[PDB]
Amino acid sequence: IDPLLTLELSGVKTYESQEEAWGARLYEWLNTYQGEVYGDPSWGNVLPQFKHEPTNLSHVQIAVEAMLLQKLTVDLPDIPISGLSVAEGDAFDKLKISIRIRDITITQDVVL
Amino acid sequence: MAPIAYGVYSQADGVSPYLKVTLTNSQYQVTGYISQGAAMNMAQNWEVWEGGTPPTFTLPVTFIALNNPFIEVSGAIAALTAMISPELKAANVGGQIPERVTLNIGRRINITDVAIQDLSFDLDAPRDSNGYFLKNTVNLQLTGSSIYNSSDIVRAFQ
Amino acid sequence: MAPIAYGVYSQADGVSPYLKVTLTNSQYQVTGYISQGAAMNMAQNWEVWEGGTPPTFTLPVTFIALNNPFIEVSGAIAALTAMISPELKAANVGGQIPERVTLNIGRRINITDVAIQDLSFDLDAPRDSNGYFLKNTVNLQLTGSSIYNSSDIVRAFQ
Amino acid sequence: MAPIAYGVYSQADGVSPYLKVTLTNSQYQVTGYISQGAAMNMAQNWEVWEGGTPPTFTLPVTFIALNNPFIEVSGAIAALTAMISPELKAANVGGQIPERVTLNIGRRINITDVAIQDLSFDLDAPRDSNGYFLKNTVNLQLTGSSIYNSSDIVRAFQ
Amino acid sequence: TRQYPLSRYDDRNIADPILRAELRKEVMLMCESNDKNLTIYYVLPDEQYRPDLLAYRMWGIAELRWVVTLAAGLEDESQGMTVGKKLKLPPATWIREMIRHFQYDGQVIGTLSIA
């Protein structure tokens, strides 16, 4: 026996465990970039836009986060967004984006 | 990264980022101050409750040409009138739209789709040596793109 | 016991319980202060007296972020907009309703079924370090669920 | 003798009886003070004089809970809302009416049949330890039961 | 006055026991099918006496009592059903529609090809 994982393989069959299921769906949304998927190249995370901006240009950061959230929402209307948080780290080299659909508080370490 | 922005867009103003109003679209960004007189309203229609109405917003914003009027006032009002003005003859009849912008408030409350239905202001404020305005108070009237549900609305704040 | 509540819900505010306005439904409770400007009206139609009209209410409420703005202002306004916003697409087409809340006044006058038909307020009040509001005055417009009879109304007070 | 009554109904208030407003029906009486802002109007329709209109009355009354709020304010407003509220479902379909009350003014000017078409007031006035109101100003809108003739009207005063 | 007692909910509106049996046949097929348009919920301890109690809480109607009874396969409410069993409920309007079709024109039932 060997178990499985959720990253582009399977979390659960369908949405039984609702919130973790939506978090999984968003996970395979965010783990893909532009030009790496047939049919909808714009589908997936838009890091190619919001990679390496200066960490202190709060206007550009808020603009990019707003646009990304709105496009991912219109992309997947099934899962609306509750909480998005942007938290710097110990050094200038670490940022964290924390997305929670009211409970999931799943976070990823980004760099700008 | 982001397209061109106008108003107090940079941190050089030395003002609290929370109190800044921001509008953003695919090609334009305008940043300003949350001025007094703001209001919003949501309601419904009945006669037996029939249905609802989309959200409505009335936002007066004050703009100051502290250092660069060209980018802070003239460019700002130009972008605003471009956004409100329906561009329905841009040689692209296959998709022309009056265009909608996304609104950020307090850096935490976001309206993904809102329509700038009305704009007004006064041009009688004093100017500079070149002649760009020093101050203005532009009032804006905004509408939601649809009659949003409770599940749509309540879960959108921070 | 009761579901989540917002506003000055706990006694820790140290304020008279009588002067508190309360709204309650199956899943949300909001508690506030009885502010000036409140009014109500009941009337009828005639041309020969034809019929009557349901009760109407105009309640402005003041809210303070005394200690915890997140629960007292932000959560309060979120619950309010959830209640007023008709949730008619909650994947339960067999029973979707815009939802009605029950109102308690002076801890002795209860309106079992009333509809929040209108809401408004201002967001220009000063904020905290995080940015949550310290102050607001939200005006509400409320309607009875029917044209209540005298036997229905007079015998409902304490 | 007479049925239950509310307001400054006993002489214990020590106030001039003339300045008291009184409404009376088969089962309820309310007594108050003649407050400023009262007005009345009578008119007619024409295009060639077509016809007339019934009398109209706009009476604001102030009520004070000098000693017993339960009988002077709470009971008073309860009786008032009972009277204005059309009782058309009192298990007596053979005769249900919205009910009309008789008005006495200055203890000498009597309107036998008048309809309380509108009522309003404010509840923001300060209260007692129990919580009953100390003061209120209830404005009332009243209509005559018909377009009364000159012989009907002029000969009805004292 | 003109009055007659009835309710347009009873699956047993069809007087044929065999037709009622085949109705419960396909509804069991769907219920113990793993369709996503079914509810996902386990058993409650007090459901031993009152399987329809869950039907009342999530729908307000007791018409689902026979549905849950066939889903659990109970001989009697005296015996209990294991708490935690996988229970699935379809949208009620879907059953209403299928029975409406079956008692107006529940003729072909299986598959209509061409007139």
Q: Which two tokens stand for residue A95?
A: 């940022």
| Measured CA angle at D155 (ends D154, D156), to 5 deg | 95
d(C-alpha D158, C-alpha E19), whole Å: 86
d(C-alpha B11, C-alpha B13), whole Å: 5
What is the rounded radius of gyration, in angstroms, for the C-alpha atoms of chain A?
A: 15
Residue B24: list chain A partners with CB under 8 A: 62-63, 66-67
| Helix residue spans in chain B (DSSP H) | 69, 75-84, 150-153
Measured between CA atoms, the residue of chain A closest to residue B107 is: A62
d(C-alpha D97, C-alpha D85), whole Å: 10
CB-CB contact of B22 with A84 (8 Å): no
Q: Which two tokens stand for residue E113?
A: 């090809």
CB-CB contact of D93 with D111 (8 Å): no
E105: how many CB neighbours lie within 10 A of its CB?
A: 9
How close does chain C come to D10, measured CA to CA in Å? 23
d(C-alpha C136, C-alpha C66), whole Å: 12
Residue A60: list chain B partners with CB under 8 A: 1-2, 5
How close does chain A come to B130, measured CA to CA in Å? 28
Q: Which two tokens stand for residue B14?
A: 């030395």
Of D140, D109, D81, residue with least CA distance to D20: D109
Q: Would the CA dihedral through B107, B110, B116, B119 be positive or negative?
A: negative
The whole-angstrom distance between residue B5's C-alpha and the CA centroid of its chain comes to 12
Beta D29-34 vs D5-7: how paired, if at all? parallel
Q: Which two tokens stand for residue A40?
A: 């909808």
Residue B108: list chain C partners with CB under 8 A: 131
Residue E40: list chain A partners with CB under 8 A: 16
Q: Would the CA dihedral through D91, D94, D95, D98 be positive or negative?
A: positive
How close does chain C come to D106, measured CA to CA in Å? 27
Q: Which two tokens stand for residue E17?
A: 């026991």
Of E24, E29, E65, E28, residue with least CA distance to E47: E65
- Give Dmax over CA atoms of chain D in angstroms: 62
CB-CB contact of C98 with B147 (8 Å): no
Of B129, B124, B16, B138, residue with least CA distance to B76: B138
Beta B101-105 vs B109-120: how paired, if at all? antiparallel
Cβ-count burial of A9 within 10 angstroms (0-12 exposed, 13-18 middle, 19+ buried)? Answer: exposed
d(C-alpha A31, C-alpha A18), whole Å: 20
Measured between CA atoms, the residue of chain E closest to residue A14 is: E36
State the count of interchain CB pairs (< 8 A) between A and B: 61
CB-CB contact of B72 with B8 (8 Å): yes
Experimental method: cryo-EM
d(C-alpha A54, C-alpha A33), whole Å: 21
CA distances from C102 to C29, C48, C132 (A): 9, 35, 27
> Do the Cβ atoms of B149 and C123 come within 8 Å?
no
Q: Which residue of B105, B150, B155, B158 to mutate against C (max C Cβ within 10 Å)?
A: B150
CB-CB contact of B145 with B139 (8 Å): no
How close does chain A come to E76, measured CA to CA in Å? 30
d(C-alpha C29, C-alpha C76), whole Å: 9
CB-CB contact of D7 with D72 (8 Å): yes
First to last CA, chain C: 25
| Measured CA angle at C87 (ends C84, C92), to 5 deg | 155
Q: Is A16 on the interface with E (CB under 8 A)?
A: yes
- Give Dmax over CA atoms of chain E in angstroms: 51
Main-chain phi, psi angles of C119, to 5 degrees: -145, 145
Q: Which two tokens stand for residue C39?
A: 């009014």
d(C-alpha C40, C-alpha C50), whole Å: 22
Q: Which two tokens stand for residue C27?
A: 């899943």
CA distances from D141 to A44, D39, D61, D116 (A): 65, 10, 11, 6
> Do the Cβ atoms of D82 and C150 come within 8 Å?
yes
d(C-alpha D24, C-alpha E36), whole Å: 67
SS3 at position D9: coil
Question: Which residue has tokens 């935690």?
Answer: E84
CA distances from A70 to A80, A85, B101, B132 (A): 9, 15, 11, 35
How close does chain C come to D15, measured CA to CA in Å? 28
Q: Which residue of D124, D143, D145, D147 to mutate against C (max C Cβ within 10 Å)?
A: D124
Q: Facing residues of D114 across strands?
A: D101, D144
Residue E106: CB partners within 8 Å, gap ≥ 6? E19
d(C-alpha C68, C-alpha C16), whole Å: 19
C and D in touch (3+ CB pairs within 8 angstroms): yes
Measured between CA atoms, the residue of chain D closest to residue C148 is: D85
Beta B5-7 vs B29-34: how paired, if at all? parallel
How close does chain C come to B59, measured CA to CA in Å? 10
Per-residue 3-state assignment (H helix, E strand, C coil) for C93-133: CCCCECCCEEEEECCCEEEEEEEEEEEEECCCCCECCCCCE
> Do the Cβ atoms of C154 and D79 come within 8 Å?
yes
CB-CB contact of C121 with C139 (8 Å): yes
CB-CB contact of C70 with C129 (8 Å): no
How close does chain C come to E82, measured CA to CA in Å? 29
Cβ-count burial of B137 within 10 angstroms (0-12 exposed, 13-18 middle, 19+ buried)? Answer: middle
In terms of phi and psi (left: phi > 0; alpha: psi -120 to 50; beta: otherwise), the region of D51 is beta
Chain B positions contacting chain A at CB under 8 Å are 1-2, 5, 9-11, 17, 20, 22, 24, 26, 29, 31, 102, 104, 107, 110, 112-113, 151-152, 155-156, 158
Question: Which residue has tokens 């407050």?
Answer: D35
Q: Which contacts qualify for E103-106: CB closer than 8 Å, 24 or more apart?
A: E103/E13, E103/E14, E106/E19
* Strands, E assignment, C25-108: 29-34, 39-42, 44-46, 49-52, 56-64, 101-105
Helix axes A18-30, A58-75, angle to 10 degrees: 120
Q: Give me the count of residues in chain B.
A: 158
Subunits next to A (3 or more Cβ pairs <8 Å) are B, E
CB-CB contact of D57 with D116 (8 Å): no
Q: Is A78 on the interface with E (CB under 8 A)?
A: no
Q: Which two tokens stand for residue D15?
A: 């106030």
First to last CA, chain A: 41
Of A60, A72, A91, residue with least CA distance to A29: A72
Quote the DSSP letter at residue E24: H
Q: Is E92 on the interface with C (CB under 8 A)?
A: yes
The whole-angstrom distance between residue B151's C-alpha and the CA centroid of its chain comes to 24
SS3 at position B135: strand
B43: how many CB neighbours lie within 10 A of its CB?
A: 17
Q: How many helices (H) and strands (E) does chain E have?
A: 4, 0
Question: Which residue has tokens 């000693």?
Answer: D67
